[PDB]
């Protein structure tokens, strides 16, 4: 068919404006507003916002000619996802009261979509990303509600499964897409994004913790685990590379290894040495994943999926120390994986519809498909 | 003369030191101050780096202008608040000095690529004087509510810059310029400033908000206004472009118009639905301004605005003032109607008059102004590397 | 109605319906509101059989749209390698310039259509033809990052047809 | 409303075109890879040509057990979009 992109001058504006108008109407009909630590509480959500917009936004900008789309589409996805997550977390956990904690939780839900979208970025347009944002936020909320109903946990505390849900959802959606690279300056911008994610990831591991000592220990463990991982990553990148050089792309994903590994168990680890051991093991598994997974589409999302599974497994191991609960937690993990896979499949078949005017497979990873550039022939 | 700029910089710094010695004496708002700081120096400076051959001047003159501006604004605002007496310096003084720097940087965006650093020092001094006087008039004489400063910072800075750029009009640049064009990595770098401004704007509108309900509302209303603004700006960029392609000029700037237009109503009880309405209208207005009013201003009114600050700061700032008036109409605030209207009118008029006088001073051929062919070029004032 | 149905059939590739309209008397040179005839619509969608059939029934090969694009321009911008080959095989002017000065080679180079660029060069496309902006196919592929296209255009140089 | 009356295989003209005229003027002998012409006759007039064209298909079989895997059986429609 025609490899020249179809005009979205009627699809994209109507779709986005309708979405925003519906969000405004729902906020009118269902949301309501209403101290000492106002700034302290605002700081955590602000850290999550920096990690979403800047960290994940630039982490996927490493593409030679898709950096514009990566950054701007991540911004758009965050803006849509926070509003929709506010409404949906209101609907599935009760009128919706807008506090800073609810905005923080909506930001976490949006970050799930932002992590998933790295597996599909460069192969989709903005409308498909809108569909992905909506369906993925809905699926994560449904998963949390199902867990809260079955295992009698809090709906908000079920958001700890977000690493593995995002990883497997993105893997499934990328698997459903039609089948098909770096530059120095985009790689440096991606290093900026990766550094911001790595410096603020202790905020990802303790937004849902109320007790101050729990948050303290979680941030301690995340900080030390992330420190060991950076060393294992930059050091072991050479082993897991055919020409024995350090890979910038591998480093960008692998620095977050310890943070992902201790994410679900940071508040439970009692001493920094155990967090450091977990960070080292996560770095070694990242090296092995880089060396092995391409043999058996995105390798970084595959190793992130492995790391999230490892984090849940080490949570299972550590929770026993602090056998029915083992079965219950294995069941929670398997339900999370099953729902992530099924919802990713549904999203993938939705994204394959002709109505979205997806880019031709020859036109992947290219900003000229979506953006205006000068001195180009336009139209027919 | 090549020694005009170092002479003026040294003389201005010595004057700043003397004024601090004469007038100045010696923690919950420090994180918000640092957010505003990042907005001032990383946000605007890298936001203006879209020009392919003016990135050095953009970020560096941003740093220089804002560094002079915080000192001079500290002195002027403190003298106004103390009626010529000695005053102490807290976190609020630093925040307000950063706000004065923001106003000067907004005006800088209008004249970017056509002015010298010396002209920028002069404009910084004069503009901060005018801005601080108008802001004192709004805050203490009118006693209007402008906690996010849609009127006193954004509208003032935009129309001050527009008046200066109108006085500094060059006939040879009306049809365009070969250096006035963006590059790929330049727009990638501009996205950094865009994202930092978007991320930290809730602290911009809530830093000096009254603690309690007002500060919380300033944060929540700014956040949802920006969330709606992003979607509407994306939607309208595609709608005004052939085949609905996105324009990086729109996604770099119009995505931030919600923060500007919600500033007056930030602390007021307008509700998160109302803040999103304001943000959507701001994004639409900003996109429409870039696509239709900027060519009209450049070609017909002979007002060239390099960064389109009229579309990000001027029109959304006016929209924010009108939103404040309307919110006063429907009981969202206890401030008077006439005082909000007078604040808007005084901000715009003072900006225009001060910009006229400042631009008339900047038009003297004593400041090393670039030639028409040398506009939007770093090499006039910088040593430029051989490769990109 | 008849001309609109014929143009819709040409766009959709329904060769049988289009062949019926021409039997019934629909002029083959009719074009839509944008100046695109059946050959342009078939060239956009890669319908090689429709292109051949329309060329057999004496459609004007060098008919330009309202933007000045020939069928070869549209086929090169759409990256239809077989349609480009078929149009050149029937005598399409590879060096045609649109209203804004674009050539088929420029459209192929800006869109990273390496096969179309290689074929158009082997057929005597002159890569020194600049647009009204002064831009060449080499210059647009450098701006757009099309490195495979930049290599082929420089390495061919002037091997000519 | 698409009943066939008879089919004329035009053996004389096709056999002349296919260098087969010395074999017969009544039996159809055709050489592979070259088109040959037949005339299909309908019992009643065909009102609408395009739906009728959509409603018909042709099948060629050779041997006693024709199959698509053996390339001894082929089914093709009647259209200008066919692979010549």
Short mmCIF file of N, CA and C in Angstrom, two decimals, chain B residues 65-217:
data_model
loop_
_atom_site.label_atom_id
_atom_site.label_comp_id
_atom_site.label_asym_id
_atom_site.label_seq_id
_atom_site.Cartn_x
_atom_site.Cartn_y
_atom_site.Cartn_z
N UNK B 65 21.57 37.18 32.02
CA UNK B 65 20.45 38.08 32.26
C UNK B 65 19.77 37.74 33.57
N UNK B 66 19.54 36.46 33.84
CA UNK B 66 18.84 36.09 35.06
C UNK B 66 19.72 36.28 36.29
N UNK B 67 21.04 36.08 36.16
CA UNK B 67 21.93 36.32 37.29
C UNK B 67 21.99 37.79 37.66
N UNK B 68 22.08 38.68 36.67
CA UNK B 68 21.96 40.10 36.96
C UNK B 68 20.57 40.43 37.49
N UNK B 69 19.56 39.76 36.94
CA UNK B 69 18.19 40.10 37.26
C UNK B 69 17.80 39.77 38.68
N UNK B 70 18.28 38.65 39.21
CA UNK B 70 17.92 38.30 40.58
C UNK B 70 18.49 39.31 41.57
N UNK B 71 19.73 39.76 41.36
CA UNK B 71 20.31 40.78 42.23
C UNK B 71 19.56 42.10 42.13
N UNK B 72 19.36 42.59 40.90
CA UNK B 72 18.71 43.88 40.73
C UNK B 72 17.26 43.84 41.19
N UNK B 73 16.55 42.74 40.91
CA UNK B 73 15.19 42.60 41.37
C UNK B 73 15.09 42.48 42.88
N UNK B 74 16.04 41.78 43.51
CA UNK B 74 16.11 41.77 44.96
C UNK B 74 16.17 43.19 45.50
N UNK B 75 17.09 43.99 44.96
CA UNK B 75 17.27 45.35 45.46
C UNK B 75 16.00 46.18 45.25
N UNK B 76 15.44 46.14 44.04
CA UNK B 76 14.31 47.02 43.72
C UNK B 76 13.06 46.60 44.49
N UNK B 77 12.75 45.30 44.50
CA UNK B 77 11.56 44.82 45.20
C UNK B 77 11.68 45.03 46.71
N UNK B 78 12.88 44.82 47.27
CA UNK B 78 13.07 45.07 48.69
C UNK B 78 12.93 46.53 49.05
N UNK B 79 13.47 47.42 48.20
CA UNK B 79 13.34 48.85 48.44
C UNK B 79 11.87 49.27 48.39
N UNK B 80 11.11 48.71 47.45
CA UNK B 80 9.69 49.02 47.38
C UNK B 80 8.95 48.52 48.61
N UNK B 81 9.25 47.30 49.06
CA UNK B 81 8.54 46.75 50.22
C UNK B 81 8.97 47.41 51.52
N UNK B 82 10.15 48.02 51.55
CA UNK B 82 10.66 48.66 52.76
C UNK B 82 10.58 50.18 52.72
N UNK B 83 10.08 50.75 51.62
CA UNK B 83 9.95 52.20 51.45
C UNK B 83 11.27 52.92 51.69
N UNK B 84 12.33 52.39 51.09
CA UNK B 84 13.65 52.98 51.18
C UNK B 84 14.44 52.63 52.42
N UNK B 85 13.91 51.77 53.28
CA UNK B 85 14.61 51.35 54.48
C UNK B 85 15.39 50.06 54.21
N UNK B 86 16.24 49.70 55.17
CA UNK B 86 16.93 48.42 55.10
C UNK B 86 15.93 47.28 55.24
N UNK B 87 16.23 46.17 54.57
CA UNK B 87 15.33 45.02 54.60
C UNK B 87 16.15 43.75 54.70
N UNK B 88 15.51 42.71 55.23
CA UNK B 88 16.12 41.40 55.40
C UNK B 88 15.78 40.50 54.22
N UNK B 89 16.59 39.46 54.04
CA UNK B 89 16.46 38.56 52.90
C UNK B 89 16.09 37.18 53.41
N UNK B 90 14.93 36.69 52.97
CA UNK B 90 14.52 35.33 53.21
C UNK B 90 14.36 34.54 51.93
N UNK B 91 13.65 33.42 52.04
CA UNK B 91 13.39 32.60 50.86
C UNK B 91 12.42 33.31 49.92
N UNK B 92 11.51 34.13 50.46
CA UNK B 92 10.53 34.82 49.63
C UNK B 92 11.18 35.88 48.75
N UNK B 93 12.20 36.56 49.28
CA UNK B 93 12.94 37.53 48.48
C UNK B 93 13.63 36.86 47.30
N UNK B 94 14.23 35.70 47.53
CA UNK B 94 14.87 34.95 46.45
C UNK B 94 13.86 34.49 45.41
N UNK B 95 12.69 34.03 45.87
CA UNK B 95 11.64 33.61 44.94
C UNK B 95 11.18 34.79 44.08
N UNK B 96 10.97 35.95 44.69
CA UNK B 96 10.50 37.12 43.95
C UNK B 96 11.57 37.64 42.99
N UNK B 97 12.84 37.55 43.38
CA UNK B 97 13.92 37.91 42.47
C UNK B 97 13.96 36.98 41.26
N UNK B 98 13.74 35.68 41.48
CA UNK B 98 13.63 34.76 40.36
C UNK B 98 12.44 35.09 39.48
N UNK B 99 11.35 35.58 40.08
CA UNK B 99 10.20 36.00 39.28
C UNK B 99 10.53 37.20 38.40
N UNK B 100 11.27 38.16 38.93
CA UNK B 100 11.71 39.29 38.12
C UNK B 100 12.61 38.83 36.97
N UNK B 101 13.50 37.87 37.27
CA UNK B 101 14.31 37.27 36.21
C UNK B 101 13.44 36.62 35.15
N UNK B 102 12.37 35.93 35.57
CA UNK B 102 11.45 35.31 34.62
C UNK B 102 10.82 36.33 33.70
N UNK B 103 10.40 37.47 34.25
CA UNK B 103 9.82 38.52 33.43
C UNK B 103 10.81 39.01 32.37
N UNK B 104 12.06 39.23 32.79
CA UNK B 104 13.06 39.72 31.84
C UNK B 104 13.36 38.66 30.78
N UNK B 105 13.35 37.38 31.16
CA UNK B 105 13.60 36.32 30.18
C UNK B 105 12.46 36.20 29.18
N UNK B 106 11.22 36.41 29.63
CA UNK B 106 10.09 36.42 28.72
C UNK B 106 10.24 37.54 27.70
N UNK B 107 10.67 38.72 28.15
CA UNK B 107 10.90 39.81 27.20
C UNK B 107 12.08 39.50 26.28
N UNK B 108 13.10 38.81 26.80
CA UNK B 108 14.24 38.40 25.99
C UNK B 108 13.81 37.49 24.85
N UNK B 109 12.83 36.63 25.10
CA UNK B 109 12.34 35.74 24.06
C UNK B 109 11.79 36.48 22.85
N UNK B 110 11.35 37.73 23.03
CA UNK B 110 10.82 38.50 21.91
C UNK B 110 11.93 39.05 21.02
N UNK B 111 13.07 39.39 21.60
CA UNK B 111 14.16 40.03 20.88
C UNK B 111 15.34 39.08 20.66
N UNK B 112 15.13 37.78 20.87
CA UNK B 112 16.21 36.81 20.75
C UNK B 112 16.76 36.77 19.33
N UNK B 113 18.09 36.80 19.22
CA UNK B 113 18.77 36.72 17.95
C UNK B 113 19.03 38.05 17.27
N UNK B 114 18.47 39.14 17.79
CA UNK B 114 18.63 40.46 17.18
C UNK B 114 19.26 41.47 18.12
N UNK B 115 19.62 41.07 19.34
CA UNK B 115 20.16 41.99 20.32
C UNK B 115 21.49 41.46 20.86
N UNK B 116 22.29 42.38 21.36
CA UNK B 116 23.59 42.11 21.96
C UNK B 116 23.44 41.83 23.45
N UNK B 117 24.44 41.18 24.06
CA UNK B 117 24.42 41.02 25.53
C UNK B 117 24.39 42.34 26.29
N UNK B 118 25.03 43.39 25.75
CA UNK B 118 25.00 44.70 26.38
C UNK B 118 23.58 45.26 26.41
N UNK B 119 22.88 45.18 25.27
CA UNK B 119 21.47 45.53 25.21
C UNK B 119 20.67 44.73 26.23
N UNK B 120 21.05 43.47 26.45
CA UNK B 120 20.34 42.63 27.40
C UNK B 120 20.56 43.08 28.84
N UNK B 121 21.77 43.52 29.18
CA UNK B 121 21.99 44.08 30.51
C UNK B 121 21.15 45.33 30.73
N UNK B 122 21.13 46.22 29.73
CA UNK B 122 20.36 47.46 29.86
C UNK B 122 18.87 47.15 30.00
N UNK B 123 18.37 46.23 29.17
CA UNK B 123 16.97 45.85 29.22
C UNK B 123 16.63 45.20 30.55
N UNK B 124 17.55 44.39 31.09
CA UNK B 124 17.33 43.78 32.40
C UNK B 124 17.11 44.83 33.47
N UNK B 125 18.00 45.83 33.52
CA UNK B 125 17.89 46.86 34.56
C UNK B 125 16.57 47.62 34.42
N UNK B 126 16.31 48.14 33.22
CA UNK B 126 15.14 49.00 33.03
C UNK B 126 13.84 48.21 33.21
N UNK B 127 13.78 47.01 32.64
CA UNK B 127 12.59 46.19 32.72
C UNK B 127 12.30 45.77 34.15
N UNK B 128 13.33 45.44 34.93
CA UNK B 128 13.07 45.07 36.32
C UNK B 128 12.52 46.26 37.09
N UNK B 129 13.03 47.46 36.82
CA UNK B 129 12.47 48.64 37.47
C UNK B 129 10.98 48.77 37.16
N UNK B 130 10.63 48.70 35.87
CA UNK B 130 9.22 48.86 35.47
C UNK B 130 8.34 47.74 36.01
N UNK B 131 8.83 46.50 35.93
CA UNK B 131 8.07 45.34 36.40
C UNK B 131 7.82 45.41 37.89
N UNK B 132 8.85 45.77 38.67
CA UNK B 132 8.70 45.83 40.11
C UNK B 132 7.73 46.93 40.50
N UNK B 133 7.78 48.07 39.80
CA UNK B 133 6.82 49.13 40.12
C UNK B 133 5.39 48.71 39.80
N UNK B 134 5.17 48.08 38.63
CA UNK B 134 3.82 47.64 38.29
C UNK B 134 3.34 46.55 39.23
N UNK B 135 4.23 45.65 39.65
CA UNK B 135 3.83 44.56 40.53
C UNK B 135 3.52 45.08 41.93
N UNK B 136 4.27 46.07 42.40
CA UNK B 136 3.92 46.74 43.65
C UNK B 136 2.56 47.42 43.54
N UNK B 137 2.30 48.08 42.40
CA UNK B 137 1.02 48.74 42.19
C UNK B 137 -0.13 47.74 42.23
N UNK B 138 0.05 46.58 41.60
CA UNK B 138 -1.01 45.57 41.58
C UNK B 138 -1.20 44.95 42.96
N UNK B 139 -0.10 44.64 43.66
CA UNK B 139 -0.19 43.90 44.91
C UNK B 139 -0.65 44.77 46.08
N UNK B 140 -0.25 46.04 46.11
CA UNK B 140 -0.46 46.88 47.29
C UNK B 140 -1.45 48.02 47.07
N UNK B 141 -1.53 48.58 45.87
CA UNK B 141 -2.46 49.67 45.60
C UNK B 141 -3.80 49.09 45.14
N UNK B 142 -3.76 48.24 44.11
CA UNK B 142 -4.97 47.56 43.67
C UNK B 142 -5.34 46.41 44.59
N UNK B 143 -4.34 45.75 45.19
CA UNK B 143 -4.54 44.57 46.04
C UNK B 143 -5.28 43.46 45.29
N UNK B 144 -4.95 43.28 44.02
CA UNK B 144 -5.54 42.22 43.22
C UNK B 144 -4.80 40.90 43.45
N UNK B 145 -5.51 39.80 43.18
CA UNK B 145 -4.97 38.46 43.36
C UNK B 145 -4.37 37.99 42.04
N UNK B 146 -3.04 37.86 42.01
CA UNK B 146 -2.32 37.41 40.83
C UNK B 146 -1.22 36.42 41.23
N UNK B 147 -1.59 35.40 42.02
CA UNK B 147 -0.60 34.57 42.70
C UNK B 147 0.29 33.83 41.69
N UNK B 148 -0.25 33.49 40.53
CA UNK B 148 0.56 32.89 39.49
C UNK B 148 1.11 33.87 38.49
N UNK B 149 0.69 35.13 38.58
CA UNK B 149 1.26 36.25 37.83
C UNK B 149 1.06 36.09 36.32
N UNK B 150 -0.17 35.76 35.92
CA UNK B 150 -0.52 35.82 34.50
C UNK B 150 -0.40 37.24 33.98
N UNK B 151 -0.69 38.22 34.82
CA UNK B 151 -0.68 39.63 34.46
C UNK B 151 0.67 40.28 34.73
N UNK B 152 1.19 40.14 35.95
CA UNK B 152 2.36 40.90 36.37
C UNK B 152 3.66 40.34 35.80
N UNK B 153 3.71 39.06 35.45
CA UNK B 153 4.94 38.49 34.90
C UNK B 153 4.77 38.19 33.42
N UNK B 154 3.77 37.39 33.08
CA UNK B 154 3.68 36.82 31.74
C UNK B 154 3.18 37.85 30.73
N UNK B 155 2.02 38.46 31.00
CA UNK B 155 1.53 39.52 30.12
C UNK B 155 2.48 40.71 30.10
N UNK B 156 2.99 41.10 31.27
CA UNK B 156 3.93 42.21 31.33
C UNK B 156 5.18 41.92 30.51
N UNK B 157 5.79 40.75 30.73
CA UNK B 157 7.00 40.42 30.00
C UNK B 157 6.77 40.32 28.51
N UNK B 158 5.65 39.72 28.11
CA UNK B 158 5.35 39.58 26.69
C UNK B 158 5.17 40.93 26.02
N UNK B 159 4.36 41.82 26.60
CA UNK B 159 4.12 43.09 25.93
C UNK B 159 5.28 44.06 26.07
N UNK B 160 6.08 43.95 27.13
CA UNK B 160 7.34 44.68 27.20
C UNK B 160 8.27 44.25 26.07
N UNK B 161 8.43 42.94 25.89
CA UNK B 161 9.27 42.45 24.81
C UNK B 161 8.74 42.83 23.44
N UNK B 162 7.42 42.82 23.28
CA UNK B 162 6.82 43.21 22.01
C UNK B 162 7.05 44.69 21.71
N UNK B 163 6.94 45.55 22.73
CA UNK B 163 7.22 46.97 22.53
C UNK B 163 8.68 47.20 22.17
N UNK B 164 9.60 46.51 22.86
CA UNK B 164 11.02 46.64 22.55
C UNK B 164 11.30 46.17 21.13
N UNK B 165 10.75 45.01 20.76
CA UNK B 165 10.99 44.46 19.43
C UNK B 165 10.36 45.31 18.34
N UNK B 166 9.24 45.97 18.64
CA UNK B 166 8.67 46.92 17.70
C UNK B 166 9.56 48.13 17.49
N UNK B 167 10.12 48.67 18.57
CA UNK B 167 11.05 49.79 18.42
C UNK B 167 12.31 49.34 17.67
N UNK B 168 12.79 48.13 17.96
CA UNK B 168 14.00 47.60 17.35
C UNK B 168 13.73 46.93 16.01
N UNK B 169 12.67 47.32 15.31
CA UNK B 169 12.30 46.70 14.05
C UNK B 169 13.38 46.89 13.00
N UNK B 170 13.70 45.82 12.28
CA UNK B 170 14.61 45.86 11.14
C UNK B 170 13.82 45.52 9.89
N UNK B 171 13.94 46.37 8.86
CA UNK B 171 13.24 46.12 7.61
C UNK B 171 13.78 44.89 6.89
N UNK B 172 15.07 44.60 7.04
CA UNK B 172 15.68 43.48 6.33
C UNK B 172 15.29 42.12 6.86
N UNK B 173 14.60 42.06 7.99
CA UNK B 173 14.24 40.80 8.62
C UNK B 173 12.74 40.51 8.57
N UNK B 174 11.95 41.39 7.95
CA UNK B 174 10.50 41.21 7.95
C UNK B 174 10.09 39.99 7.14
N UNK B 175 10.78 39.73 6.02
CA UNK B 175 10.46 38.60 5.17
C UNK B 175 11.06 37.29 5.66
N UNK B 176 11.91 37.33 6.67
CA UNK B 176 12.56 36.15 7.19
C UNK B 176 14.07 36.30 7.20
N UNK B 177 14.73 35.23 7.64
CA UNK B 177 16.18 35.22 7.75
C UNK B 177 16.65 33.78 7.61
N UNK B 178 17.82 33.60 6.98
CA UNK B 178 18.31 32.25 6.75
C UNK B 178 18.79 31.59 8.04
N UNK B 179 19.24 32.39 9.01
CA UNK B 179 19.63 31.84 10.30
C UNK B 179 18.44 31.57 11.21
N UNK B 180 17.29 32.17 10.93
CA UNK B 180 16.09 32.01 11.76
C UNK B 180 15.39 30.71 11.36
N UNK B 181 15.96 29.60 11.83
CA UNK B 181 15.44 28.28 11.52
C UNK B 181 15.94 27.33 12.60
N UNK B 182 15.13 26.32 12.92
CA UNK B 182 15.51 25.34 13.91
C UNK B 182 16.26 24.17 13.27
N UNK B 183 16.90 23.38 14.11
CA UNK B 183 17.53 22.14 13.70
C UNK B 183 16.91 20.99 14.48
N UNK B 184 17.27 19.77 14.09
CA UNK B 184 16.69 18.58 14.71
C UNK B 184 17.13 18.45 16.17
N UNK B 185 18.44 18.41 16.41
CA UNK B 185 18.93 18.30 17.77
C UNK B 185 18.67 19.57 18.57
N UNK B 186 18.57 20.72 17.89
CA UNK B 186 18.19 21.95 18.58
C UNK B 186 16.79 21.85 19.18
N UNK B 187 15.85 21.29 18.42
CA UNK B 187 14.50 21.09 18.95
C UNK B 187 14.49 20.03 20.04
N UNK B 188 15.34 19.01 19.90
CA UNK B 188 15.50 18.04 20.98
C UNK B 188 15.97 18.71 22.27
N UNK B 189 16.91 19.65 22.16
CA UNK B 189 17.38 20.37 23.34
C UNK B 189 16.31 21.31 23.88
N UNK B 190 15.50 21.90 23.00
CA UNK B 190 14.42 22.77 23.45
C UNK B 190 13.36 22.00 24.23
N UNK B 191 13.17 20.72 23.89
CA UNK B 191 12.25 19.87 24.65
C UNK B 191 12.65 19.76 26.11
N UNK B 192 13.95 19.87 26.43
CA UNK B 192 14.39 19.82 27.82
C UNK B 192 13.80 20.98 28.61
N UNK B 193 13.94 22.19 28.08
CA UNK B 193 13.37 23.35 28.74
C UNK B 193 11.86 23.27 28.83
N UNK B 194 11.22 22.82 27.75
CA UNK B 194 9.77 22.62 27.77
C UNK B 194 9.35 21.69 28.90
N UNK B 195 10.01 20.54 29.01
CA UNK B 195 9.61 19.54 29.99
C UNK B 195 9.86 20.02 31.41
N UNK B 196 10.98 20.70 31.64
CA UNK B 196 11.24 21.19 33.00
C UNK B 196 10.24 22.27 33.39
N UNK B 197 9.90 23.17 32.47
CA UNK B 197 8.87 24.16 32.76
C UNK B 197 7.53 23.50 33.07
N UNK B 198 7.15 22.50 32.26
CA UNK B 198 5.89 21.81 32.47
C UNK B 198 5.87 21.08 33.81
N UNK B 199 6.98 20.44 34.16
CA UNK B 199 7.04 19.64 35.38
C UNK B 199 7.01 20.52 36.62
N UNK B 200 7.66 21.68 36.58
CA UNK B 200 7.83 22.47 37.79
C UNK B 200 6.90 23.68 37.87
N UNK B 201 6.04 23.90 36.88
CA UNK B 201 5.10 25.02 36.95
C UNK B 201 4.18 25.03 38.16
N UNK B 202 3.69 23.90 38.70
CA UNK B 202 2.88 23.99 39.93
C UNK B 202 3.60 24.65 41.09
N UNK B 203 4.92 24.54 41.19
CA UNK B 203 5.65 25.28 42.21
C UNK B 203 5.78 26.75 41.86
N UNK B 204 5.80 27.07 40.56
CA UNK B 204 5.85 28.46 40.13
C UNK B 204 4.61 29.22 40.58
N UNK B 205 3.44 28.59 40.48
CA UNK B 205 2.18 29.24 40.79
C UNK B 205 1.81 29.14 42.26
N UNK B 206 2.56 28.38 43.06
CA UNK B 206 2.21 28.15 44.45
C UNK B 206 3.32 28.50 45.43
N UNK B 207 4.46 29.01 44.96
CA UNK B 207 5.59 29.25 45.84
C UNK B 207 5.26 30.29 46.91
N UNK B 208 4.71 31.43 46.50
CA UNK B 208 4.35 32.49 47.44
C UNK B 208 2.85 32.48 47.73
N UNK B 209 2.17 31.38 47.47
CA UNK B 209 0.77 31.26 47.84
C UNK B 209 0.63 31.15 49.35
N UNK B 210 -0.48 31.65 49.87
CA UNK B 210 -0.72 31.61 51.30
C UNK B 210 -0.83 30.16 51.76
N UNK B 211 -0.09 29.76 52.79
CA UNK B 211 -0.09 28.34 53.20
C UNK B 211 -1.47 27.88 53.66
N UNK B 212 -1.78 26.63 53.36
CA UNK B 212 -3.09 26.09 53.64
C UNK B 212 -3.86 25.74 52.38
N UNK B 213 -5.11 26.20 52.30
CA UNK B 213 -5.97 25.83 51.19
C UNK B 213 -5.50 26.46 49.88
N UNK B 214 -5.00 27.70 49.95
CA UNK B 214 -4.64 28.42 48.73
C UNK B 214 -3.45 27.78 48.02
N UNK B 215 -2.47 27.36 48.82
CA UNK B 215 -1.23 26.80 48.24
C UNK B 215 -1.56 25.44 47.63
N UNK B 216 -2.37 24.65 48.31
CA UNK B 216 -2.80 23.34 47.79
C UNK B 216 -3.55 23.52 46.47
N UNK B 217 -4.50 24.46 46.41
CA UNK B 217 -5.29 24.72 45.19
C UNK B 217 -4.37 25.22 44.07
#
